Amino acid sequence: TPVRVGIVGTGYAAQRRAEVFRGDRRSQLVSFWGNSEANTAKFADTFGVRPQQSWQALINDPEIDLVLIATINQLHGAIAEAALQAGKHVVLEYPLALTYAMGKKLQQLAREKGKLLHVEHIELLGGVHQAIRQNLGKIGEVFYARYSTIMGQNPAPQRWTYHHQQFGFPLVAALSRISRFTDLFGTVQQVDAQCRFWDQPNPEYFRACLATAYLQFNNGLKAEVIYGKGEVFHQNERIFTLHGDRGTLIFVGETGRLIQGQTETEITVGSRRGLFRQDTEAVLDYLTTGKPLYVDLEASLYALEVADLCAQACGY
Ligand SMILES: NC(=O)c1ccc[n+]([C@@H]2O[C@H](COP(=O)([O-])OP(=O)(O)OC[C@H]3O[C@@H](n4cnc5c(N)ncnc54)[C@H](OP(=O)(O)O)[C@@H]3O)[C@@H](O)[C@H]2O)c1
Ligand SMILES: C=CC1=C(C)/C(=C/c2[nH]c(/C=C3N=C(/C=C4\NC(=O)C(C)=C4C=C)C(C)=C\3CCC(=O)O)c(CCC(=O)O)c2C)NC1=O
Ligand SMILES: C=CC1=C(C)/C(=C/c2[nH]c(/C=C3N=C(/C=C4\NC(=O)C(C)=C4C=C)C(C)=C\3CCC(=O)O)c(CCC(=O)O)c2C)NC1=O
């Protein structure tokens, strides 16, 4: 300490990190690596840091102790691996990797190098998920559950989140959909999935995708995971429904209600706080005082495992 940080990426997540790292006594933002020249210059000017020429040069820099990986999904695996070999602590924005196999390597590698390997999961710090668990008890045995997120976007940009290789399998990239269910109900017994893309004229990109996963949990629960975004969607949704034999929990965006006997009581849901700030501090609290992190790497790797299985169910 101060934990000297190099940041890989200059996007939204990378900026929230820079803000907290800088403003936090225990940490020192040292370097960063980006992509486009404009945003590498914006990031450098905004935060007072100079950019490495390559991410390889960033992770080998002896004057950083921790690599923060907030770049495109496709690069998570190789960069996390190179940084662990180079003896750095590695914090990643999810997904850990684009395949379950690669994530297992990183876990094993980080173990045998004695370095922190943490995957951020801000969906587990949000109002919806905390309210779901504040209230899970009073709806009995959850037998039927669905989480639909539909993000219509017309036109679809030819940015990295619509690129097959850089984004990866959509349910691997949108790991927070499955992660929620595994955090609440544990091991999945059975996996069925379908994915369908609408290509761009340049088919490296897609203008839309619909990914559906049908999960059967060991404890009897049936769960539906619906992820869709792009040009063919005309109605947005962010709906989490949980049917128990004692009641129903429904969360529509950030509003929640408990439903018992065909009647509903409103549920208070927490503010859209700096979830990135919570995570950053959780990392700095763990590295200094040993306070356990709010999510385990094991749980993150398990979410990827279920998601990787969804990618096999789709032939992908
Ligand atoms: N709330 C969140 O945003 C959120 C939450 C959870 C996890 N994550 C994880 O965030 C990582 C960062 O995502 P984001 O949401 O911050 O996206 P973003 O704002 O688009 O930032 C991505 C960074 O992408 C770099 N980049 C883009 N294309 C690249 C390429 N082809 N090769 C190398 N670098 C490239 C961007 O380049 P330019 O300089 O060209 O912009 C910039 O440096 C992903 O794992 C994302 O899923 C994000
Ligand atoms: C408007 C553009 C916008 C972009 C480009 C964006 C990127 C983005 N947001 C994500 C999750 C998330 N993104 C946010 C919040 C934000 N993220 C933001 O970029 C911004 C500006 C906010 C909020 C003002 C949250 C809370 C999650 C967690 C979602 C969850 O709980 O599942 C993810 C991870 C993959 C996924 O779950 O789909 C990405 C790539 N989010 C956006 O809202
Ligand atoms: C042009 C606006 C706008 C867009 C394009 C948008 C889309 C959007 N919201 C996302 C996550 C998210 N973004 C937010 C929240 C916000 N997001 C915000 O832009 C703001 C101000 C909040 C404020 C709370 C949330 C809650 C998610 C949750 C996960 C989801 O809905 O998929 C993602 C995930 C990553 C991806 O696959 O690209 C996208 C595209 N939301 C938008 O509001």
Numbering used by the authors: 9 to 324
How is this structure described in the published paper?
PCC 6803 (Syn BVR)13 as a target for the structural analyses. BVR catalyses the reduction of the C10 double bond (γ-methene bridge) of BV using NAD(P)H to produce BR, a reaction in which the hydride (H−: a proton and two electrons) is donated by NAD(P)H. Syn BVR is composed of 328 residues and shares more than 20% sequence identity with rat and human BVR proteins. Syn BVR consists of two structural domains (N-terminal and C-terminal domains), with the active sites in an obvious cleft between them.
The BV-bound crystals belong to a different space group (P21) than those of the apo- and NADP+ soaked forms (P212121), and the asymmetric unit contains four BVR molecules (A to D molecules). The configuration of NADP+ in the ternary complex was identical to that in the NADP+-soaking crystal. One BV (the proximal BV) was bound in close vicinity of the nicotinamide ring, and the other one (the distal BV) was located on the upper stack with the proximal BV. The C10 double bond in the proximal BV, which is to be reduced, faces the nicotinamide C4 carbon (origin of the hydride) of the NADP+; the distance between the C10 carbon of the proximal BV and the C4 carbon of the NADP+ is 2.6 Å, and the angle between the C10 and nicotinamide ring was ∼120°. This configuration of the proximal BV appears suitable to accept the hydride from the nicotinamide ring, and strongly suggests that the hydride is directly transferred to the C10 carbon in the proximal BV. The distal BV is located ∼4 Å above, translated by ∼2.5 Å to the solvent side and rotated ∼45° relative to the proximal BV. Instead, the guanidine group of Arg185 formed hydrogen bonds with the carboxy group of the propionate side chain of the proximal BV (within 2.8 Å in all molecules of the asymmetric unit); thus, the Arg185 must first donate its proton to the propionate side chain of the proximal BV.
